[PDB]
């Protein structure tokens, strides 16, 4: 499944949003370097949400197809609706 | 952690990276109230919690 | 040390010693009640 | 006492009288001892098996009755009262 | 059967191992030779046997010890000699010290009785075949063939050996089966002079196998049958749970050490000083572990147990370990990569570097919005107290400066 | 026997290092991890030469850490039974001789020494010698020994050697 032709949805799913936000928040809580200006922000979840809106989360989503192959999408390559 | 488990907006435990639990009910020695970055504090549920 | 109990029948106070069976010395009744505490009891009148 | 009996909870036993029983009129709270009872072992030679007030409940001892049961063993019943204001 | 081990049900000799002497079915009594139980204090005071039974309720039974005629002579008791046996208080005692006595068959136990090794020492064919062991065929038409123990049994093992270039399985009994191993291979001894030990064999003599113990570079010759092949390492599990691996102990009040190695007879306990000293099971007595303590370090920072530290100075250099026990001026480090001393060594604490009286009293709240209320203190810190209020069914926290104890 | 083999190792990374120097801390931890270890299947690991590739790490749910499969080429020293190698005598006593082959230590038993050699407690430096004294082996000597056994202890294989065959002696 060459990422030349990724055939899955170009929109981030709601499940991907939920899990990416949680995982990044846990990383921030464990002193991972932050990717945006924190100005007056302290809650790891709020920081993770800021990073998501800025398209700065350093995470790749690996989507498995039923056939067994997978596609890798950078969190910044997907369209975030909600 | 200074407030402890009796003043409501307080905390019940300190868990160190070693994994050992420090019980804040049986008021412990002030050396065991020390917090550093690895630790976690089991704080009381407060406003805005999900 | 005294441990005064009230007899349920004849209402007689009488000493009782731990390990001593329960029995009124006057009437032989086997039910006794403890006396009210001497500790300070204070109520708000609410 | 904590020198002889072993399994003593951290609850105070000073509310008990010398007969091992609480007296009427004493305020009590959850996890407070109201009947002190020990069983001799086969912190030495005695295991605490006291009766504690139910957790989360509170009240004042109303009356304390002492008798013998059918087989002649000492037997006590303790009534605890709790005023309930509608809320 | 004659010369068999049995036990007793009731009486003062109960739970005492015994050996049979003769059995008389007609009389329903059997003779058991066992270690006598005689009280020396009774002989000194010269008490009658009947009196001892009258007051037996509060009297402790005597222990087990070999009979001595000289001991009673000093105590003044009368000792009589009847040939080989000796008569004392209407009982026949052997010269060695064993006690011969007759008891009813019903009282004696003759089923499910098994003596212990320690018990046998005081009183003083088999096969060892286990799955996964290579065995040879010493006798029979097919000689000089080595096979693996696929099956097991009792008197007739009936193993299914797998010989070289032989898929099929043969049939051989226990006596025909023999235990043989090739040179330079792991071998384990279940029974022997030093049982539960592992070593490698440089050669295999016809009947005297030679191996070298990992514990010490010394020869150990044992019967080949008692030998076994086991790729698994020697567990070295202790007997009775007297101590545990990596446990602090107090050999002497000044010196405290941690047991790093476990053996059948000896112990190799690592003391604070760092040297290795050998001791026995009985002499070493357990010491509790300091679940909480304090110490000092070069950096002048607090150090507790279970912290990763580096030995930048001291007996060891550039060494990393985990603290398991702490001493005033010493600390015990733990590891898994260190071969020497079972992975546990000791270094100085300083050289290591980072890598209630009011409870239960009755109080009156004398200030604040709860002034006048009265309660019992359930918990007090140095500044604040928990007061169960007599009137409100609530326990509140109150600054201790607002309390006055009510006196009787 | 020294060998050059490619092995694989998964290194766990705390989110603390999810910074610009992440790939570097990955290899730093690999070096700290594998180097100096010993294993029965691959023998001693002497050094890490290169790192073939770092796989994409994975985020393990709930846990903060990220795991990386790091395939790496390393030098390993594995002896074998029936192998003749050079060794360095480090201590000599009446019981026998103790030698070293790289990290491994070896002990030569009396049954592995030719009959001509005999123990001599009287000598000041204990040594193995025969009456002719054609060949003398003492501490720091170079010997050629045949490996007769392998025994693994606390993730550290130890071997027993032999010099009983012809042409094995101080050259
Ligand atoms: Zn009465």
Swiss-Prot record, chain E:
Compartment annotation: Nucleus
Binding-site residues, RNA: 288
Annotated DNA binding sites: 328
Tissue distribution of the protein: Ubiquitously expressed.
PTM sites of type N6-acetyllysine: 371
Motif mapping: UBR5-degron: 55-61
Post-translational changes noted in the entry: Methylated by PRMT1/HRMT1L2 and PRMT5/SKB1. Methylation negatively regulates interaction with P-TEFb and RNA polymerase II. Phosphorylated by CDK7 and CDK9. Phosphorylation by P-TEFb (CDK9) at Thr residues of the C-terminal repeats alleviates transcriptional pausing and promotes transcription elongation. Dephosphorylated by the INTAC complex when transcripts are unfavorably configured for transcriptional elongation, leading to premature transcription termination: dephosphorylation is mediated by the PPP2CA component of the INTAC complex. Dephosphorylated by the PNUTS-PP1 complex in termination zones downstream of poly(A) sites, thereby promoting deceleration of RNA polymerase II transcription.
Chain ranges of the KOW domain: 1-33, 129-160, 181-212, 303-336, 357-390
Domain of life: Eukaryota
Chain spans, region Interaction with RNA polymerase II: 40-129
Complex formation: Interacts with SUPT4H1 to form DSIF. DSIF interacts with the positive transcription elongation factor b complex (P-TEFb complex), which is composed of CDK9 and cyclin-T (CCNT1 or CCNT2). DSIF interacts with RNA polymerase II (Pol II); forms DNA and RNA clamps that stabilize Pol II elongation complex while maintaining the nontemplate DNA strand in the transcription bubble and nascent RNA in the exit channel. This interaction is reduced by phosphorylation of the C-terminal domain (CTD) of POLR2A by P-TEFb.
Protein purpose: Component of the DRB sensitivity-inducing factor complex (DSIF complex), which regulates mRNA processing and transcription elongation by RNA polymerase II. DSIF positively regulates mRNA capping by stimulating the mRNA guanylyltransferase activity of RNGTT/CAP1A. DSIF also acts cooperatively with the negative elongation factor complex (NELF complex) to enhance transcriptional pausing at sites proximal to the promoter. Transcriptional pausing may facilitate the assembly of an elongation competent RNA polymerase II complex.
Family, as annotated: Belongs to the SPT5 family.
Stated name of the protein: Transcription elongation factor SPT5
Organism this protein belongs to: Homo sapiens (Human)
């Amino acid at each position: 499944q060459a990422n030349q032709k990724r055939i899955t949805t170009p929109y981030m799913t709601k499940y991907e949003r939920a899990r990416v936000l949680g995982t990044r928040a846990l990383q921030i809580a464990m002193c991972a370097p932050v990717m945006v200006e924190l100005e007056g922000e302290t809650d790891p979840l709020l920081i993770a949400m800021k990073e998501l809106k800025a398209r700065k989360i350093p995470i790749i989503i690996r989507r498995y197809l039923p056939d067994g192959s997978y596609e890798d999408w950078g969190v910044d390559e997907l369209i975030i609706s909600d | 952690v200074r407030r402890g488990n009796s003043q409501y907006p307080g905390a019940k435990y300190i868990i160190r990276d070693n994994g050992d639990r420090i019980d804040l009910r049986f008021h412990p020695k002030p050396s065991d109230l020390h917090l550093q970055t690895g630790y976690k504090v089991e704080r009381h549920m407060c406003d805005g919690d999900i | 040390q005294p441990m005064i109990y009230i007899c349920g029948e004849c209402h007689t106070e009488n000493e009782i010693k731990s390990r001593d069976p329960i029995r009124c010395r006057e009437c032989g009744y086997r039910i006794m009640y403890k006396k009210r505490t001497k500790r300070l009891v204070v109520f708000d009148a609410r | 006492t904590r020198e002889t009996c072993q399994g003593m909870r951290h609850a105070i036993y000073d509310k008990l009288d010398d007969d091992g029983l609480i007296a009427p009129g004493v305020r009590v709270s959850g996890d407070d001892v109201i009947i002190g009872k020990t069983v001799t072992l086969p912190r030495y030679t005695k295991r605490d098996c006291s009766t504690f007030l139910r957790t989360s409940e509170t009240g004042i001892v109303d009356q304390v009755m002492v008798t013998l049961n059918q087989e002649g063993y000492k037997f006590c019943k303790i009534r605890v009262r709790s005023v309930r204001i509608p809320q | 059967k004659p010369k068999s081990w049995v036990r007793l049900k009731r009486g003062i000799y109960k739970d005492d191992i015994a050996q049979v002497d003769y059995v008389e079915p007609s009389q329903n009594t059997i003779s058991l030779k066992m270690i006598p139980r005689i009280d020396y204090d009774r002989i000194k005071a010269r008490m009658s046997l009947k009196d001892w039974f009258a007051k037996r309720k509060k009297f402790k039974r005597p222990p087990q010890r070999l009979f001595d005629a000289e001991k009673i002579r000093s105590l003044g008791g009368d000792v009589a000699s009847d040939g080989d046996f000796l008569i004392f208080e209407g009982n026949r005692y052997s010269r060695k010290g064993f006690l011969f006595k007759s008891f009813a068959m019903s009282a004696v136990i003759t089923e499910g009785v098994k003596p212990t090794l320690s018990e046998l020492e005081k009183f003083e064919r088999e096969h060892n075949f286990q799955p996964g062991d290579n065995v040879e065929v010493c006798e029979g038409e097919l000689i000089n063939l080595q096979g693996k123990i696929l099956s097991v049994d009792g008197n007739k093992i009936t193993i299914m050996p797998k010989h070289e270039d032989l898929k099929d399985m043969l049939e051989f009994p226990a006596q025909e089966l023999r235990k043989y191993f090739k040179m330079g291979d792991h071998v384990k001894v279940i029974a022997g002079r030093f049982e539960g030990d592992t070593g490698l064999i440089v050669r295999v003599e016809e009947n005297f196998v030679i191996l070298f113990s990992d514990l010490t570079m010394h020869e150990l010759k044992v019967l080949p049958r008692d030998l076994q092949l086991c790729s698994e390492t020697a567990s070295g599990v202790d007997v009775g749970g007297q101590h545990e691996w990596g446990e602090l102990v107090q050999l002497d009040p000044q010196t405290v050490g941690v047991i790093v190695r476990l053996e059948r007879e000896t112990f190799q306990v690592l003391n604070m000083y760092g040297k290795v000293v050998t001791v026995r099971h009985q002499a070493v007595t357990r010491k509790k572990d300091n679940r909480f303590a304090v110490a000092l370090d070069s950096e002048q920072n607090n150090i507790h147990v279970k912290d990763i530290v580096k030995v930048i100075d001291g007996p060891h250099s550039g060494r990393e370990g985990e603290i398991r026990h702490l001493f005033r001026s010493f600390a015990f480090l733990h590891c898994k990569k260190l071969v020497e001393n079972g992975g546990m060594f000791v270094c100085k604490t300083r050289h290591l570097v980072l890598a209630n009286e009011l409870i239960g009293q009755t109080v009156r709240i004398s200030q604040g919005p709860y002034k006048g209320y009265i309660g019992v203190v359930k918990d007090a810190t140095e500044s604040t107290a928990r007061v169960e209020l007599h009137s409100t069914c609530q326990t509140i926290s109150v600054d201790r400066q607002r309390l006055t104890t009510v006196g009787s | 026997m020294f060998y050059h083999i490619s092995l694989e190792h998964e290194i766990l990374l705390h989110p603390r290092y999810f910074g610009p120097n992440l790939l570097n801390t990955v290899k730093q931890k690999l070096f700290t991890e594998v180097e100096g270890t010993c294993t029965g299947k691959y023998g001693f690991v002497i050094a890490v030469t290169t790192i073939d590739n770092i796989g994409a790490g994975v985020i393990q749910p709930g846990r903060g850490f990220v795991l990386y499969p790091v395939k790496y080429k390393a030098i390993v020293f594995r002896p074998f039974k029936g192998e003749v190698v050079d060794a360095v005598v480090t201590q000599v006593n009446k019981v026998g001789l103790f030698t070293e082959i790289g990290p491994m230590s070896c002990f030569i038993s009396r049954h592995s020494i030719p009959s001509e050699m005999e123990f001599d407690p009287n000598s000041n430096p204990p040594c193995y010698k025969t009456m002719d004294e054609d060949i003398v082996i003492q501490q720091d000597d170079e010997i050629r020994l045949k490996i007769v056994g392998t025994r693994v202890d606390k993730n550290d294989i130890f071997a027993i050697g032999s010099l009983m065959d012809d042409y094995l002696g101080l050259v």
